[PDB]
């Protein structure tokens, strides 16, 4: 019959197609069941997040999913408009850091430095501790201590200082009485007093010699007048600046000797010589102590003459 030569060969070509489909299915299924994927799970809202990595043709229980590990050097971020590729991590000698082209904005972070008591600390409420800083510009200290700081001329130093803790002298004083030569029971002044000022100051000074009164005496016996003389002679570095003779009326020596800075020591020599009334009567002379003051020598608003 005709029916035995067309539809009976269908059982063989159908078998050949079934064998080809079996081979394709074996090739594809054995690679589907070996395939690992990123597994998508759900919240109770329909949100579909990445929950980890697992076999594609399985279910798991959202547990025993082997975590979403990414290889760090393989992840980068793109703008899908220009195609600019930005790696997430940068390698620095077996340490991986974030790319830091992000990382442009921190709000209320806590930052601490290395050592373990830390030198640097930034608290999220904004307390800053530096402890190993180098600052410049606009400091308003409420407490603390300066140690080796050069305070400038234009720094206002409102506040007090002690009278001590001033290097210079501003004023000094010194004093001495003339040697007294005596005979019997009467003494008279006679000798030399030397006043030496050491040149150990950066500024000009004046040696104010407070008034020095000296006098002699007069005796009238049997109508004969005997004068007891007094001679005061002052030497400044050997130069005679004064020479006085007093008979019975007083003479007074006072002076302001100038002491410039760097010119060396100033030596003032006060020498008193007394003369006897006669060959027998001891002298009756008087001379007040040597009193001297060295001042800071300001020549400004105090005019004389």
């Amino acid at each position: 019959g005709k029916e035995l030569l067309e539809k009976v060969e269908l059982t063989e070509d159908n078998a050949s197609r079934l064998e080809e489909f079996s081979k394709e299915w074996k090739d594809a299924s054995d690679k589907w069941n070996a395939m690992w994927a990123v597994k998508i799970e759900q919240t109770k809202d329909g949100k579909h997040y990445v929950a980890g990595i697992g076999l594609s043709m399985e279910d798991t229980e959202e547990g025993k999913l082997s975590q979403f590990l990414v290889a760090a050097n393989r992840i980068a971020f793109i703008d899908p408009a220009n195609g600019n590729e930005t790696p997430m991590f940068v390698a620095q000698g077996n340490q991986i850091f974030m790319n830091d082209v992000f990382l442009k904005r921190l709000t209320a972070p806590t930052i601490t430095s290395g050592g373990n008591p830390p030198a640097f600390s930034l608290t999220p409420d904004g307390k800053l501790t530096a402890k190993n800083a180098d600052i410049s510009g606009s400091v308003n200290a409420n407490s603390g201590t300066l140690s080796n700081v050069t305070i400038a001329e234009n720094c206002t130093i409102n506040g007090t200082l002690r009278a001590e803790k001033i290097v210079g002298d501003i004023v000094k004083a010194a004093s001495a009485a003339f040697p007294r030569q005596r005979e019997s029971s009467v003494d008279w002044p006679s000798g030399t007093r030397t006043v030496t000022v050491t040149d150990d100051h950066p500024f000009d000074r004046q040696i104010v010699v407070l008034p020095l009164t000296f006098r002699g005496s007069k005796r009238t016996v049997s109508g004969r007048t005997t004068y007891s003389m007094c001679y005061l002679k002052v030497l400044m570095n050997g130069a005679v600046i004064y020479d006085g003779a007093a008979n019975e009326a007083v003479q007074v020596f006072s002076r302001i000797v100038d002491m410039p800075a760097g010119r060396g020591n100033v030596i003032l020599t006060f020498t008193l010589t007394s003369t006897r009334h006669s060959a027998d009567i001891p002298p009756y002379t008087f001379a007040s102590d040597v009193q001297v003051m060295v001042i800071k020598k300001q020549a400004l608003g105090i005019s004389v003459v």
Binding site: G115, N116, P117, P118, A119, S121, T123, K127, T129, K131, N132, S147
Partner: protein, 160 residues
């Protein structure tokens, strides 16, 4: 009472034993059994603190005991002259290194999750020694910075 007889002088430390019992026990066991002899103040930052008790004269770390628990919640603060236990990143990792506060370090005080640093001692005499030590020149940029150029050696430690 403990002596730290250093090359700079003598530092007298009164131990706050009633507030940090096990910390001060650990410190006294180290100082008693000759540990801190010939050990340097390896980390000196002027205005901050001076840190010692871990490294020998040639920058060689010593072998400590197993660490101690942090006792920083005793309410003792990191004020000038107090000793706090120095530790690593771990909160209960303090073994042997300590430091003296040369100034007021408020950011090192805490008893919380952020455990801070446990104060257990106070310099009662020889604060001038600590002041001379704090100002020595320190330059070892690299492995350990702020290492004094000429080491500040603790010659011996004597207990009372």
């Amino acid at each position: 009472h403990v002596l730290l007889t250093t090359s700079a002088g003598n530092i007298e430390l009164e131990l706050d034993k009633q507030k940090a019992p096990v910390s001060v026990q650990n410190f006294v066991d180290y100082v008693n059994s000759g540990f801190y002899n010939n050990t340097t103040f390896h980390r000196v930052i002027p205005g901050f603190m001076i840190q010692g008790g871990g490294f020998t004269e040639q920058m060689q770390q010593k072998k400590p005991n197993p660490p101690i628990k942090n006792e920083a919640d005793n309410g003792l603060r990191n004020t000038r002259g107090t000793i706090a236990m120095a530790r690593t990143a771990d909160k209960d990792s303090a073994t042997s290194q300590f430091f003296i506060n040369v100034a007021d370090n408020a950011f090192l005080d805490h008893g919380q999750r952020d455990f801070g640093y446990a104060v257990f001692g106070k310099v009662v005499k020889g604060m001038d020694v600590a002041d001379k030590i704090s100002q020595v020149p320190t330059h070892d940029v690299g492995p350990y910075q702020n290492v004094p150029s000429k080491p500040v050696v603790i010659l011996s430690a004597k207990v009372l």
